[PDB]
């Protein structure tokens, strides 16, 4: 559980069903029977989204 919070620097609530849908997309290719930690972390990495705070934006 701890890791799932760590990986993305931006995520919102609506985005958790999206990353779950993304992990599941990669996972079906492998043709598995379980959902690995491997699938989640890749899922966070692609469409992680811009670090808006540093450039300008929110901050």
């Amino acid at each position: 559980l701890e890791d799932y919070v760590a990986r993305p620097d931006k995520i919102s609530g609506a985005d958790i069903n999206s990353i779950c849908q993304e992990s599941g997309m990669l996972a079906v290719r492998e043709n598995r029977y379980i959902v690995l930690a491997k699938d989640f972390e890749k899922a966070y990495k692609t469409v992680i989204k811009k670090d808006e705070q540093e450039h300008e934006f929110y901050k």
Binding site: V5, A6, D9, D51, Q53, E54, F57, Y58, K59
Partner: protein
């Protein structure tokens, strides 16, 4: 050769005691970094979010805890470039006081002078006022002090206030909580706990940055030290 473009007033009065465009600037500091400041009554301690959320941070001098002078430190929330000018300006102001008085600039005075430029940028066309709010510390009059200067240029006097993410909620928790008569070591422990409440995610020592002002003088705490305080308290 020459530049024009935008030189008519961009700022219109709203009935609220503030203009529209400044009100929007205060939301900018809210989406800014968490920074907490509590006056311990035997020095002031100020703590700020070290990160800009890339989580590769390697600080040795590139801090957002900066000594202006002997006993003044600044930690901020909001914009980076807007802050750098205030730091450069602050040293020139402190020294301006240092030449005349042979003591650097009190908290109250430094605030009056920084505040006048921030308003300048509002009223004028083709400029925008800062997106920065300051937690200013100092030891003057024989007492530690802590002031808040907002991005408008207005000042609110605080013994404890919080900025950054959940700032509004931050001020009410401090207003009730705030402590005094604190030993130096305790000052750090209270300050870190308050920082835990504002700031989310991981804290280690390359995520948060702490600076203390006391009698000996303002300095900025080494990354090893911050870690020992953080662990200690619940």
């Amino acid at each position: 050769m020459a530049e024009r473009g935008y030189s008519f007033s961009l700022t219109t009065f709203s009935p609220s005691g503030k203009l529209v465009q400044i009100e929007y600037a205060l939301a900018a500091v809210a989406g800014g970094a968490p920074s907490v400041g509590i006056k311990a009554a035997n020095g002031v301690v100020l703590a700020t979010e070290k990160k800009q959320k890339s989580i590769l941070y390697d600080e040795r001098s590139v801090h957002k805890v900066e000594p202006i002078t002997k006993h003044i430190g600044l930690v901020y929330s909001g914009m980076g470039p807007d802050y750098r000018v205030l730091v450069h300006r602050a040293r020139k102001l402190a020294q301006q006081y240092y030449l005349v008085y042979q003591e650097p600039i009190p908290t109250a005075q430094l605030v009056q002078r920084v505040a006048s430029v921030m308003q300048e940028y509002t009223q004028s066309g083709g400029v925008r006022p800062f997106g920065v709010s300051l937690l200013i510390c100092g030891w003057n009059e024989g007492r530690p002090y802590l002031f808040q200067s907002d991005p408008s240029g207005a000042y609110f006097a605080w013994k404890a206030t919080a900025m950054g993410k959940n700032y509004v909620n931050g001020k009410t928790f401090l207003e009730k909580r705030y402590n005094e008569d604190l030993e130096l070591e305790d000052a750090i422990h209270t300050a870190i706990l308050t920082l835990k409440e504002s700031f989310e995610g991981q804290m280690t020592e390359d995520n948060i940055e702490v600076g203390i002002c006391n009698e000996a003088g303002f300095r900025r705490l080494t990354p090893t030290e911050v870690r020992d305080y953080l662990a200690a308290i619940a």
